[PDB]
Amino acid sequence: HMTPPKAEKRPYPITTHGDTRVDDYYWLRDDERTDPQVLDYLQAENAFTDAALKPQQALRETLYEEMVARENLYFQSVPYVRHGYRYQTRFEPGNEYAIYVRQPQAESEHWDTLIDGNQRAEQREFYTLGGLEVSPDNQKLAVAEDFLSRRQYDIRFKNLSDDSWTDEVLENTSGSFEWANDSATVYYVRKHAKTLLPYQVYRHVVGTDPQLDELIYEEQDDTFYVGLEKTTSDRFILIHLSSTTTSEILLLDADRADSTPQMFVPRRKDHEYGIDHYHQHFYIRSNKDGKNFGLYQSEQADEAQWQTLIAPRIEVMLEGFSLFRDWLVVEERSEGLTQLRQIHWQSGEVKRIAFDDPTYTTWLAYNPEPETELLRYGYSSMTTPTTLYELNLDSDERVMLKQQEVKNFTPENYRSERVWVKARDGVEVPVSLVYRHDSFARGTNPLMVYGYGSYGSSMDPAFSASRLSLLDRGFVFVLAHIRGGGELGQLWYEDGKLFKKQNTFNDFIDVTEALIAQGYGDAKRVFAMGGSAGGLLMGAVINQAPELFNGIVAQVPFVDVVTTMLDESIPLTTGEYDEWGNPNQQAYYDYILQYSPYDQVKAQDYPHMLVTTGLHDSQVQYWEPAKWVAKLRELKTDDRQLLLYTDMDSGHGGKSGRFKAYEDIALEYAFILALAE
């Protein structure tokens, strides 16, 4: 039926390594966001998407309604105790924002309001709370708020004795701050006024003019993120400096005045470490001796005196650790499973936390007090809604503290499996899938295959309430744990980045082909979805294996890879040479160009596709998906659906942000379910 929008072609040559690429849609990039022709193309595409998807309005209403109907009792958090006060977060129906309350630990009956986001948001266009922490003496509240939607945080201070606010505001911060043990001095991170990268640590005295703040540290390499931490012992504030590959920590005495940063271990390329301090020792998670990390104990900074607690192991990735009175607890990955292990400081007794599920995730939860035998940990699986457990590290007593509530849901209606796929290079790739039992018939069900596959980020198997909208309409939902993710540890990541990035796309295709061959789904009704670096996945896979998928959802997709990675004026580019490579080197130009989806669009049949972008935010700049759709409309030889949906909003936040998230999922799922009919 309808004629889609046709972006004007303005041939723009880019020559690198003597190779000229002609980009007809280079002009859709407008950093200033004013070009009226660029806006007219984005708006034209939105109007086309609106028109093409109009008949799906009734289904979108049905999905949105059943998705919101799964949630509510609006929400109260599990209380935690920190420094003799109990804290709870409360969401009431008819409140856009959380209210944070507290009470003395020995009190039951009465709760004091700490901060009411609904009150803070009054007469504002936007509100995001980026951090909250009461001073050690329980008298002052530090808050990091964004009222402007640019992820620049204002820090303010409330006197809890009379609910008065101090006069000063700390502006353009990362929201990262720590209290000195005097409850009078805070350290915070200032962002660069141009790049907005966190780069400076300041000391502030609460109540005083931020003009008087002292510059403590400034980072020279803006590939290194500046964060603040405080040790379990409260003895040190840490300046944590880190790039994607390299760390450095500086220590600030949290007890004494006029502290200056004390070097821990000087930065060394490909040495990532993090520290804590407790029981008069430094504890260090470090890859100095192996990619899967080890845990060390030290009395001093000197790397040479670091004692091995847990050696790096090829078969086990060490992700993190928590320190308690009698126990070390570590979070690890082995054989495609997350695992928790505890080791007694005195006896060396080792215990594993046991589960019984093929496709779950477990993690260390919030544990703000170390003088306890009670560990809080999280659990989720494809069939079991997210749960918070409390485990007695000594007795092994395991108690549920909170379960995600899911209305209209019977868990025994669903089944899940772990599947291992031998990839084309003979490497075993894990897969996690779930489906509704009573509608399952081998070879007949639509498949939805979800992947990410970058940065060592894992698509860990966990519960989704929205996913029930597909499962209850006969879909088999698949997580493909492809290389470039972290499911099999650091080497799984490294075997899907830089000169191995093609393994990410190959693994996704290999998993999909295997599941169809094995009878998990209908070969004619295979769908896929991914976002951001998962959108790069979508883009590469449809160029390489266009007949495999019926339909695709590509969210905010990274697709103009070579052109973006040649231009440091784009946010992210200078931080992403250690992910994709630096195409200013011919070896990386050639390797990336081979999969760069925008470059590799060809005159061939593609699947149906819905593409999303956002004008006023980004992460991937809005122009990449818009150029990509323009080029696909020019070249593709099929008559299938191709739609671009651009988020025009000034921004979101609070329950209306959750409203928007459900609307978007309902629009994407209606698109897919319409194709599966």
- Overall resolution, Å: 1.6
CA–CA gap between residue 485 and residue 504 (Å, rounded): 8
CA–CA gap between residue 525 and residue 516 (Å, rounded): 10
Which residues, in sequence order, are CB contacts of 254 under 8 Å at separation 6+?
178, 180, 181, 230, 231, 234, 235, 236, 237
- Which tokens go with 601? 């669009």
Phi, psi (deg, nearest 5) at residue 383: -115, -15
| Chain centroid to CA 392 | 30
Cβ proximity of 102 and 163 under 8 Å: no
Q: Which candidate in 617, 618, 647, 664 is catalytic?
A: 617
Cβ proximity of 200 and 189 under 8 Å: yes
Phi, psi (deg, nearest 5) at residue 311: -70, 150
601 DSSP assignment = -
619 DSSP assignment = S
- Which tokens go with 429? 């790739």
Phi, psi (deg, nearest 5) at residue 432: -125, 125
Cβ proximity of 349 and 365 under 8 Å: no
Phi, psi (deg, nearest 5) at residue 360: -135, 170
CA–CA gap between residue 108 and residue 85 (Å, rounded): 11
CA–CA gap between residue 147 and residue 651 (Å, rounded): 11
Which residues, in sequence order, are CB contacts of 490 under 8 Å at separation 6+?
287, 291, 292, 293, 317, 456
- Which tokens go with 84? 């003799």
Phi, psi (deg, nearest 5) at residue 101: -125, 165
Please name which of 480, 601, 606 lies closest in space to residue 534, comparing C-alpha atoms: 480
Please name which of 227, 248, 216 lies closest in space to residue 130, comparing C-alpha atoms: 227
CA–CA gap between residue 540 and residue 557 (Å, rounded): 11
Sign for the pseudo-dihedral over CA of 530, 534, 536, 540? negative
Cβ proximity of 411 and 382 under 8 Å: no
- Which tokens go with 663? 């609307």
CA–CA gap between residue 119 and residue 112 (Å, rounded): 15
Q: How many CB atoms lie within 10 A of CB 304?
A: 6
CA–CA gap between residue 664 and residue 465 (Å, rounded): 15
Residue 204 is among the residues annotated as catalytic for this protein: no
CA–CA gap between residue 206 and residue 188 (Å, rounded): 12
CA–CA gap between residue 100 and residue 112 (Å, rounded): 9
H or E segment at 227?
A: strand 225-230
Strand 642-647 to 608-614 pairing: parallel
CA–CA gap between residue 205 and residue 218 (Å, rounded): 19
Q: Which candidate in 247, 286, 381, 532 is catalytic?
A: 532
CA–CA gap between residue 101 and residue 141 (Å, rounded): 12
Strand 551-555 to 608-614 pairing: parallel
Please name which of 212, 238, 214, 215 lies closest in space to residue 226, comparing C-alpha atoms: 238
Please name which of 100, 115, 124 lies closest in space to residue 156, comparing C-alpha atoms: 115
498 DSSP assignment = G
Method for this entry? X-ray
Residue 652 is among the residues annotated as catalytic for this protein: yes
- Which tokens go with 172? 């353009």
CA trace torsion 14, 20, 21, 27 (10° rounding):
30
Cβ proximity of 490 and 337 under 8 Å: no
Cβ proximity of 329 and 342 under 8 Å: yes
Which residues, in sequence order, are CB contacts of 19 under 8 Å at separation 6+?
589, 593
| Chain centroid to CA 490 | 17
Residue 481 is among the residues annotated as catalytic for this protein: no
CA–CA gap between residue 41 and residue 646 (Å, rounded): 10
What residues pair up with 344 in beta bridges, in sequence order? 327
Please name which of 259, 269, 139 lies closest in space to residue 201, comparing C-alpha atoms: 259
Q: What angle do CA 187, 189, 193 make, to 5 degrees?
A: 140
Q: How long a stretch of residues is the chain?
A: 677
